[PDB]
Symmetry: D2
Subunit: 251 residues, 4 copies
């Protein structure tokens, strides 16, 4: 049978491009969403028109809470229910906003920023592993090429992305005996935030050495496709920067 993948935050932007490219590669896909039901279903409709019964949607809030472990177990379960297997987990869903150190409650911001970017990937990783040859099992975490030169006033976001690097490495070591590889893709500037102004976006584009433009979502997805492929069978614990050289540029 075809392998199956879960992509979190898959209704739009980078997660959608990842789901599309996995599907084009021959995967059946679980399209996870929180608020974007109409977009999730629109994508599933598009993929199922290409190949019947090869895409399902799955709703969950990935904010940390007392119920997050059960939510994460249910996302993994949805893949096994639809497809009978779950070969690939892509932890793409992410909250992103500033949290100044000097003046939503701060503890809500913790639950969102550290929940979506680190704790939910951790719980999904546990559930994915618990449910596990010619198999090619792997997890890809969407990281951030600027983790070591962070945006001003983004402490909690940066802490969450750092925690995700730690998860990538710890899980790669711990799951290697099961043949599960765990890797990351770290975009620099890709699709800019919808809310961001045009002038601010051009400011970011101009800093990129390679072509003075942001990565398309498809360019990010290309690195994910490589890491889940048979061409990456010895690669685990690696984080591939896809940033056009941005992280190499000094202040």
């Amino acid at each position: 049978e075809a392998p199956a993948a879960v992509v979190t935050g898959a209704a739009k932007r980078i997660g959608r491009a990842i789901a599309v490219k996995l599907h084009q590669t021959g995967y059946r896909v679980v399209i996870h969403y929180h608020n974007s039901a109409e977009a999730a279903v629109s994508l599933a409709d598009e993929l199922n028109k290409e190949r019947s019964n090869t895409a399902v949607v799955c709703q969950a809030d990935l904010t940390n809470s007392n119920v997050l472990p059960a939510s994460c177990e249910e996302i993994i379960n949805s893949c096994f229910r639809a497809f009978g297997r779950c070969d690939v987990l892509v932890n793409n869903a992410s909250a992103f906003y500033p949290t100044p150190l000097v003046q939503k409650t701060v503890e809500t911001q913790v639950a969102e920023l550290i929940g979506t970017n680190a704790i939910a990937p951790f719980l999904l990783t546990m559930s994915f592993a618990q449910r596990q040859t010619s198999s090619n099992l792997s997890i890809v975490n969407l990281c951030d090429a600027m983790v070591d030169q962070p945006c001003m006033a983004f402490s909690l976001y940066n802490m969450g992305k750092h925690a995700l690097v730690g998860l990538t490495q710890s899980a790669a070591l711990e799951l290697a005996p099961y043949g599960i590889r765990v890797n990351g893709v770290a975009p620099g500037v890709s699709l800019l935030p919808v809310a961001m102004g045009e002038e601010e976006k051009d400011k970011w584009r101009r800093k990129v050495p390679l072509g003075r433009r942001e990565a398309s979502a498809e360019q990010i997805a290309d690195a994910v496709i490589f890491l889940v492929s048979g061409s990456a069978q010895y690669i685990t614990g690696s984080i591939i920067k896809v940033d056009g050289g941005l992280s190499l540029v000094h202040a």
Copy 2:
């Protein structure tokens, strides 16, 4: 007037050595503790006998919860109540235990303890310290092995990576206030009290520089340097104090 410091998890082991060395350098200290009340009170008594009214204790659970922000605000308030200022914060308190990915505490309690103590509480204490504000600095106790982690310690490792992120992000953001933010990263220092001697010696034998763990004082010496005037231009730096351990391959 003498400067004052908050040290978290200061009743025993490395946090006590830090509080003692700060005290010996001339600081007044807040000795934070969670469960180790007798040890905390014993240390404050020793320091106060050395120079009166130079040490207080402050109790707090640093597990993450909706009241953790108020707890962290209260630890910093305790320093200002006792001493009228707060010059230095050392984020030392830490939970440390395995959380295997494949199979008493629920996973959400493990998250609240391992990520709370190692990362969120340092973050909220950093916010409270900065909000209340000369040689001001914060020192975070990091881990030199963050990129070659112990098997089955994923949540602990996530929390220490988050602490690196806080160290860098806060150094950038608080530099305009003249608050420096740095880290000290031990390799093997005081082994866990529950560990048997044979298992302790396994760890000792790994260390290139002398095949022994760091003393608590050796860790404290790096903290003392980073809060001193000899580190006035240093911010966002994490000093490994690991005897070469992190350079040793498999």
Copy 3:
């Protein structure tokens, strides 16, 4: 119409596997070699049998010396002479042996370990850029660069210098459309001279599979980085190490 690639130290082992996989991908290839003339000519014969006029050999010593720039210029020139273009450079050739700090001359060790692993890549990069679509350079790095083998100081210095070159050249050549990336093996093909017991010792250290990477696994990462699927990637070093660099002492 076919693009062309230079691979250094391409007669045997990982460089051979990279030359073969590039050729299978559609590249014309310059097979650089130093001493392995028979193996180099054998490979070119094999590739030319598959598609005529798609492989040549090029001999050069990559030890540092005052004529190394000319030698590196000549390797790049050989690609233009044979194929009229040079799209890809793979810096694979490398000397590897211990240089203990406490007791060939040391100056020869420096010329060989720093020359092959760092200075020749730099001069090849210069000549590649000066002579100039999907242009790219791939440097073979070492995943163990921050947990070095005991008594391999000069080797480790050369591989750290190569990381520096990868990043510096990525920045400097980005405006010309040339991407510069690295692939960092952990343990791949073990040295021919190493005993079976030591080989097994290294294999047992690797989390993912308890075995070394095949040369083909390393080549597969090189293929990705030169491909259209990596056209926004520059300055990146991909570890291909089965988790080895994550394992504590």
Copy 4:
């Protein structure tokens, strides 16, 4: 009996400040110099006025060449002949100028890779060969906090400074059994060229989060003094950034 230190490139700027602070700490010093003989002698005379017979000069070109190993052996020998011991080596001397990818290039290699990396390596060999519980032996290499966000067109300089990181780590591992520690100090923006226009200096100063100014040579020297002290006796293989946060600043 007083310990002794070799400082390379000690006639001016950072190396001068290191030599002065070591002398103030109680060390006898070898002031290595290449071209600045007048300044090296002037420093030796100042230090000897403070305490007789505590400073000597040693001239050597640290460009790589057939004779560089002999030169580096001589520098260490000079400390033993003057003072009967050599406790500390500070590899401070450094060439710094652009080498665009698009003086012969082999001269540039000899100067940039020889000063910044090969001479430190040969000095390290000579230091260790001479030592083959009051003792506190250590080497401090002057590294660069911006090594992973390099200046445009400085490839050979950056390669040399990355090689020096490798030396620091490799030598820490290998010399640990002899009780020799090996560490680094990595400045960001420190003493700028006096001839550099103040407009350009200000461009660099405004980049630095902590104080919007460059480090003094004394601030760099303070980190060296810590690393060679009794307070750093478990520290080996560590590189301390002294950069005011500059390396954390994104493009």
